[PDB]
Every structure is written in structure tokens, then in C-alpha cells.
Write a protein that binds this DNA or RNA. Sequence first.
RNA 1: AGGAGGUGCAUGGCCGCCGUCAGCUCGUACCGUGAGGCGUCCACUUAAGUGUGGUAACGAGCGAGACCCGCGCCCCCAGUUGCCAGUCCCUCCCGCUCGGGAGGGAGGCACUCUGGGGGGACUGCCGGCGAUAAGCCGGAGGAAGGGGCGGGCGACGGUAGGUCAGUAUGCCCCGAAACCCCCGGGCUACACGCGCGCUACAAUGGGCGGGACAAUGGGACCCGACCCCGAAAGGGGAAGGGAAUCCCCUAAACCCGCCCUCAGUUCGGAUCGCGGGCUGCAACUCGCCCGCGUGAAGCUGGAAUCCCUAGUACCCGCGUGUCAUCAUCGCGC
Lengths: 63, 195, 55, 149, 99, 134, 214
Amino acid sequence: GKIRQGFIKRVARELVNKYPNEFTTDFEHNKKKVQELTNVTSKKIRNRIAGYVTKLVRMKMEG
Amino acid sequence: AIERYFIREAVREMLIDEFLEKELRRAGYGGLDIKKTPLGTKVIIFAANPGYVIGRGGRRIRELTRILEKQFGLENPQIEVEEIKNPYLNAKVQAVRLAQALERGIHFRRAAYAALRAIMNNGARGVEIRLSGKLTGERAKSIRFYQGYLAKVGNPAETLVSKGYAQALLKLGVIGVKVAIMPPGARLPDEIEII
Amino acid sequence: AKADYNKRKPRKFGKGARRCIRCGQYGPIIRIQGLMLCRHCFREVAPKLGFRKYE
Amino acid sequence: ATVYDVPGDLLVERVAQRLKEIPEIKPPEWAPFVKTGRHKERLPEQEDWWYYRVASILRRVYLDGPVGIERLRTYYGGRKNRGHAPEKFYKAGGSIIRKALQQLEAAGFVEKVPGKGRVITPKGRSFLDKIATELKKELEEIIPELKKY
Amino acid sequence: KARIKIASTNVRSLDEVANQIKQIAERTGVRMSGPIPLPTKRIRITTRKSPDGEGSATFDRWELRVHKRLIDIEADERAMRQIMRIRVPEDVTIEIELI
Amino acid sequence: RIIQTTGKRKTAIARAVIREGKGRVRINGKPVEIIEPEIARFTILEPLILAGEEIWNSVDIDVKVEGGGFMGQAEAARMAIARALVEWTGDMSLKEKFMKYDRTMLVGDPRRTEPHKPNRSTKGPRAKRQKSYR
Amino acid sequence: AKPLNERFFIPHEIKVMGRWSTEDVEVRDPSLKPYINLEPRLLPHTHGRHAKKHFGKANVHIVERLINKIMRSGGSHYKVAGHFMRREHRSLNSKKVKAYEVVKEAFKIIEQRTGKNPIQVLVWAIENAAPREDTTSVMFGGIRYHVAVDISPMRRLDVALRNIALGASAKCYRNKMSFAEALAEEIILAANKDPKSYAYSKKLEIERIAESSR
RNA sequence: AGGAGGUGCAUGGCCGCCGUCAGCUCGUACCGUGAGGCGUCCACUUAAGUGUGGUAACGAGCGAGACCCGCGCCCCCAGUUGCCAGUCCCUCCCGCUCGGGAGGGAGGCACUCUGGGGGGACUGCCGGCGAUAAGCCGGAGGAAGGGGCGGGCGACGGUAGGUCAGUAUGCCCCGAAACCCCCGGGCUACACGCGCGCUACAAUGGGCGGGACAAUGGGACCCGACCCCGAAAGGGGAAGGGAAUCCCCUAAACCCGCCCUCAGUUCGGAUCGCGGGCUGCAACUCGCCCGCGUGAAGCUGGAAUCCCUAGUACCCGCGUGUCAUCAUCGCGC
Ligand SMILES: [Zn+2]
């Protein structure tokens, strides 16, 4: 089973809402800025958040 | 070998701690620290009531040093007594106090609720107290009082929380008291926020 | 009535030459690193002796 | 050409045949009535196993030298059939190895390194290398791929 | 020459002592051989959980890890006095020998 | 030009040194042409045969292998030799041929032993004692 | 015993075992053609690596499949030729070198006795011993029925190889015949369609039961 | 005082099973006179009360996940007690040395290695399905594709499940006995039923000689290289090692050559005789090892029944815990 976590989803949503222009559809850039802008200390969790914010930005640009 | 020295030191600290726990039950014992100095050894004992630890005239401290040196084999020990940083956050001390209250004869429900409220108001994310034994009748029971946030599974529950256990010897038998406290300032991995 | 009796005879080997320093048992004594601790005592003690259960 | 370019068994048998000539290597009087290790069930079936064993010991000293009685015994040990009990590994006897090494020393093929063991002398090294060279020359005809070596 | 062997159950204390020694060597200006990390010693003890014989057998593996570092320096008066003035925390053990 | 490569299989570690020569391939100093058993000899020989006679008779290889068994050491030496040959000639067509034939010659084998567990340990991680049921 | 040339055989081309080439090998059954792998391969030893995947053994060389199937004891919970062959410590399990040698000897015997490609003869035996239909229990409504079903190509190949290996083991069991001789005889008989072969007999048995129950 | 005397139907702590199952609950509101109900339901999805959407419920807690240890790829640092690829010297050997190989010193850390910090793997990308979400199937790249692979962590409770004979402990009892020490015996008995295993019933082999390749761990009345003695067990001296420096430690399965040729046999190794040793204060009850001698069932096993999805199962040996000696055992390699 592979389902995203509650706190991961909430953190991604609040991050994208707070910084609309600081993320794009690039996973590497989202990862860098998530590490920079979050108190996360786990690489796995940071990758989780980065991937989900990339997904959210893709949905936004799609409409 | 080097491991043999590590093991002997750990075992000696063990036996000293157990003996002191037996001796200083009414002194609000919280723990000890043993350090080596060129002259000998120094032992710091954390007690909520250093009055009992020191005694009257220093006879208790003199005899305690005598025993801890001869019986336990420590080399030229000097004993100092210090205050607990916060008795309401040390699980062992709270468990001992609750057991002593039960021995005194306070109703278990009232004592548990009072201790829980005091611990919560003194600053703690969460607390849980479990009382097991012959309560309310001949058939033993096990009742838990809980408040706040707590963790019991995983490395955070193994490390962050402080746990203590004590035995209250009443007239009808032994009551087991277990206390778990989550100290303030402890952050679980699930808690992250923007900086 | 002499005191020569009632005394354990010296023993250098066997199950009667090792006891748990904390329990006084005679059976499963751990001698891996000179612990001289009973199995039950060591189990109840390991977390605070420096030993850990990593995996 | 040297020992490393020749299969071990083909070289050992030839070394045994050649060593049969040297008079300093003779079977002990108790050789016919002895097994080669407590783990063995029945005694050898060769009537000249002494020379094969001595050749094997000499090659071992050449390769892994310096070595000693205990390590050679470890090499020459093996599994034992204990009956209903599970099979287990045991070492070999020491008299055979010690006498073989002493005979080799008398012949001049090995020498004692104090506190370390026994090492092959230049004479024994040349002897083994000559046997290996002859064997490799014989083998090259069958296997052309060994010519370049 | 002086060989120092430093062993502890805490990697952070180990590194603190190593960094202190390195700083002492750097300030004194004496060439220092980097800290050699020797293989960790893992004492493992497997014990039966149950205090009785009933129930399916379950075991717990309690492991104690000891970490070791080695350093080699060239003997000097000020350097060796400063080294002997090391903090040597409680959980760290230091041995000094001359070659 | 001396080139060094490494190969790993289970607990077998092989270090291969390749240079310019006549085609002498030695494993621990013993010629590859007399490797026993034939299974291990074929495992070691396969990359050279794939590469061809011209490249084979143009380089000298010395391989030192430790740990593992007679098959693990052979496979580690195979990996080391394949990598050494590929890096020496710098032929992308040869690398492609090796990848299509066997991806494991250049890429290692991650598989390792799974630690054993109680309930008839010393037999395997999942082997269990027979249950009476009555 | 055997010549030093055979002991130290040194291949120089990429062909099965370094002795036989599969370029001329022909497979007729269109069902089994996509699953009998005949790509160039010197050593039939893949160290597994195909169990993880699904249909991952469809790309393993046929000779490697035969070696793996031969590597066994013969029978532990199923009776072969009305007997059990529980070889505990003398089995070929975990001895791929021994299985490889046995298969090599069997192919040599087959080529000596037939004059054709041993791999081609093995292919013929597989084609002749692969069943085409079976029967199974299928439930419709509230009760079961003994219905007839077809067999997929991979299952056909599996059954053929299994039957050949089992027949070889049964022939060799406690008999003067060696394992290599038993395997060669079984393969040749299966190729020749002689009902004596365990593989052909079992194929015919399954076929007749399936036809009766269809 | 002491009590391994009773009570685990008086207890604490601990542990097995339900069960690594996904469940168990709280604040407020609302329905029912009440026990109680909703949230916790429905469609889809997940290993999961995992998640999306709809709703008289809106939020939350403990579980799951997160977390922690190890394995697999790459980079930085570190170069000893670890390593020896290049270069110099010395010595030796071969086809007489063109050429090739071995060892020791200097020297290096280049590769392996040890151990600290980091990167990498994130449905991140493509196609399809689902509804555009939850997500699922396949594909490229890649060391690692879908919980990366294996483990530690066992919720509210129950199971009057086991433990007072590990320690603690209520009650009851002995209290000069049930308390405390010394010898001797027993727990090792043996018409028989059962569980889990070892050895085998042979050629997918037995014997003989020869040739290869590990890892985990341990070492002070301890491991012991190395030499001498002995046919084996074993005995005497003794370097080194509190350990990346010395040792345990040149494993077996496997490969070659010869004998045996389907036979209760050169299979199988129970059962006794004689003799030689080791540990231990003590070896008969009741220890282990060794040489010779004999050679008991067993020729594949009914009903029934057990474990296992990948370096896993099966085969093959070794380390350690117990230890003065003794491993067909547990835990690991
Ligand atoms: Zn104890």
C-alpha cells in the first residue's frame, strides 16, 4: 500500500498556499526549496513533501 | 579487555544505584552521577529532600560513604547532595510519591487524580498513571488515568518519555504504580512547521 | 555446638560456584563479559546498563 | 614455468615418482600399519602412499611456507563418519607430518625458520620448479592455450 | 612518538575528544596523523523474554556498541602537556603510550 | 597504462589489474586456462570470448580474489574482468553487447544473505520447526 | 580416465556448452515456440534472477531449465512409478555442477547414439511430451464440476520438463543405469514417441483423462 | 531470623494468544424516555479506522504510518595494528633468462577495508484504467520502482492462559522443624503409547590418494603459533596476544585418479570384548576420546500430516550460550 500521509498533505497544501510563486513542476527545485523553507530533518519526509507539492503545482497549472 | 572495564563500571553503578534507591525511598530519590577525579571518586545524589539525605550531625552521610566505599569498592568517594531539577517531571519520583501516598492511606482515585493534575499543571505534554492490584475488593484490577498527548510505540516513545515504576506495600498486598510523562519541549517526528 | 558446620564448602566449578549478584540464583548465569547476572535480571536491566535493542 | 602454472595433483604424482629415487625419504617401519588421520575409516590402499604424502607436504611448504605441524594437520584433516551422530571435522595425526618434514630436511629441501615454521630451500625450490617445467612442457602440446604462459 | 587510543560508548563524546586533540595539534603546529576509526566492538547478548517455560519462545538481542579511535603524534613538551590537560569526559577512556 | 577494477559478489571481492601484453590472464597467479571446475572456468572465460580474440590477445590481466566460494570468486573475477576490458577499450558497442548479454557483468549483484531468525535458526530465516498439533 | 583435452576444454565461440550450437535447432509447435529460448549462450547458468519477475523464465535457456529441473531428489510427497525417492543427503539439490555434468554426459550419449543435435532431440522430446489439455474442478452455482480446460504454453513447457526429469529419475532409481544414461534414454524415447517413456505415458494419461472428463 | 513448604482462583512485574489484527476512544452538537446510537456509515482504494468523495455531524486522541538499526550504489574526510596496485633495492627459482614467478626491506593508500558526515529513489517522468480525485497496471532511465529489502518498537482490553521454583509480596503453615551444612543414592529405572530430531535404508553412491574456496564470533589460572615425543587419543617446553598486531583458523559440500557393480553388499553402524588416554577432590551407578575385534533392524514407508514465494526452500559445514569435561540442542555465520 502506497498512500500519502495526513501531515504530509497538510504541509504541502499550506506551503503551496503560502508561497505560490516559489514552486514549479520541477521536483529537484521543489525539493531544494522545501528543505530550505521547512523544519524537516528527514530526507524521506522531505522527498514526500517535495513530490506532493510538485503534484499540486501540476494540478494548478492544469486547471 | 576494554569492554571488561566498561562492564565492571556499569555493574558498579548499577549496584550503588539500587542500594541508594532502597535507602532513600522517603528522600524523593531521583538519581545519581558518579565521576572520577585524581584524588578519588565523586558521587552526586539528586534528592527532593536533602534534609533526609544529610541527616542530623552528618552521621548518615558518613555511614553512607563508609558503605559505598567498603561494600561497593569505590575508591575514596566524596558524596554531594543536590536538588531535583523538577520533581514533577521525574517519573520515578512521582511514582514513589504516589506509592507512599497509597501506603499512607489516601484513596487511590483521589491520590492518582491529584498527582496527575499536579504533574499536568507543572508543565508536561502528557501524563499517564497506571495502578494495578487489589483495589475495591479481593479481585485485583488495573486502572489508568491519562491526559494530554503521549506516545507508546516507536523510538520517540522509547526515548522522549520518562517512565517510572514503584511498589506500594499496603495491608492487603502490593500495588504496582507506573508513571509515564512526556516532558515539555519534546517534538515528535510528525510535528514540523515552516521556518 | 560448633560453627565448623553450617558453612558452604569451597567450590571452584559447577553450578554452585556462580550466583546472581542481584538475585542470588544458581541457574542461568550470564558470563559473557563477566556480568554474573541472571537471565531475568539482565533482561529487566538491559536498557539502563547501556545495552540497547537496535534491531 | 613454475608450480603455479601446473595442476596440483598432476605435479604431486610426478614429484612422488621422482622422490621415490632419493634415499633420504623412506617409509617408517610403522607405515604399513597406520591410517592417515583419526577421521579415516580404513588405512591407505596404495602401498607407496608415503611418497605421495611427502610430495604433498613438500608442495605445501613451497606454496604456503613457512608452515608448521598444526597447520599442516588442519590441512590434512577432514570429515569423520561418527555413526548416528552428525558428521564433524577433525584434524589429522602429527607423526606422519613430522617425520615427512624431518626426512625432507635431511634431504635438504626444507629448513627450519625458528619460531615460524619450515620454509623451502633453494635446492628444493629448483627441484620442484624443474618437475613443474617438465610437466608444463608435456601439457603445452595438448593445450595450445598454455603456450603464451 | 606518542600513540593515543580513545574509546567510548558515545560517538559525540568520541568526536569531541578527537576535535580537541586536533585543535591542540593545529595550534601547536605539530604534524598530526588523522584519527583512525577502528572497527566498532558490538557485544550482543540474546536472552529469552519469558521468565517461565510456557508459551512460544521469544528472544531479545541486547547490543552494546563501543567505538574506538587511534591517533599518532610526535612528542613535544607543550603539546604533551596540553594533551594531558584534556577534558577526558566520563564516558570516554584514553590511553597514552610512547614509542 | 595500468588500469584497476573491482568486482563484488556475496562475500567475494576481486581486484583486477589490466595492462598491455600478450593475453595472459591469471587468477591469483594461476592461469585461467586450467581453472577447475569447468563451470567456474566458463564463468570467468565468458567475457573474453564475448569481446573477441583480438582484444583477448592484446591485454594482460592479473586478478586477486578473496572471500566467498569457488563460484562467488569466479563471478567476482568475471565482473572485474568485464569492467576492466570495457574501460580499457572504451568501446560503446562492446558495452552494449555486454549489457544485452548479461547486465550483471558490469552491474554488481545486490543479493546477500538474509539474517536468520529464531524457531529453528541455523537453518534459515523462514525455516520453522514442525508443529505437533496434538 | 577422460582425456586431458576434455578435462581442460577451452571454448572459443559462443555456443551452448561451447560444443553444440542452436542455430539449426527448429521448434514447430507455434504455442511453444515463443517460450523455448534458443538465444546464443555459452554457459546455461543465470544464478536465478528470473523468479522475481512474472513470465521471467520465458527468457532462460532451455538447457538451464533442464539442469534446474534435474537438480532435485525425485519425489517426497508424490509417488513416482509407484514409489518414493526420498534421497536426503545424496540428492542433487544445491549441486548445479553435478547437474551440469550429468546433462553434459546425457547430451553426449544422445549425440553418439542418434547422430543428430542433442538439443534438437531434446526439443523434439519436449514437443512430444507437452500435453494439450487437462481437467480441473470449477464451481458454478453451489456445487463443483469436473470440467476440462486447456494448458497455457508455459505450463506445457513446465509439465514436459518435469515429466522428463521425473522419468529419468525413476529409470535411474536403484538400477544399474546411471543418471546420465537414464536421462539420455528417457529423452530419446520421448522423441521417438515410444510409450515406454514416463513423459509420453504420463502425457497420454492426462490427455485421456481430460478427453473422458470433457 | 530463615523457608525452591501452600495459594499464579489474593497480587506486582514479566511473558504466550486474540494479533503487526486494525481496531479502541474523547470534546461539543444532534436522534432515542433508556440501555444505547451518530461521528466509527455508504462507493472506490489501501497491508492498515490507509486515503478521496457523499452524508446529522464538526474536530481530536491512542493504534497504523512516521520513527530507530542493518544491507545494497556513489562522493568527502581519515591511512594504523588494516591494504600492496605502480616505483627503487636485496635474495632465490624457471625453458638459462629475452622473458616469467616468489619472498624481505624501504616506500605508497592508489584498490579492498575499517567509520564519521553527505548524495541517491522521490508515482519524480511517459502510456493506459478509474472520475479529472484516492489510487492501480505497464514502460524508460537507474544499483536500488512502487512499504527499496530484512528487522526493533505489541494500543484500549480480555484470555481467573504461564510464572510465589528468578527476584518483591498479602494470607496460611514449620520455626528447632519444612531452617542451615556433610557424606551416599535419585532426578540417568523400563513389558509399553506419543512429540521433535540424528543416522540410514545406496551408484543423484562407499572407500583410498591428491586439488581448491568463507563468514560470524571468542580468548587471563585464557587462546596458544612453533619445536621435540607418540600409531591415534594425547603428553613436555614454549613465542605472541587485554586484541584490525597473536591465536582459535589451510571447513564441508565440490573437483580430479583408482577399487567396488545393484548385493543386507567394501551399504547401514546399532550392540558387546580387550586395551590406551583426558577433565575433574570423585568417573561403578552416571562422563568424553582413541586402536583392534563382531556386525542389529533397515532395500523408500498406510491412513494422515509439516515448512517454505528468491540468495528464499533444499543440501554443506563453522562460531558462540550452556562448560573442570560433555552438543544429535538454542541463537547466529
Ligand atoms: Zn538474578
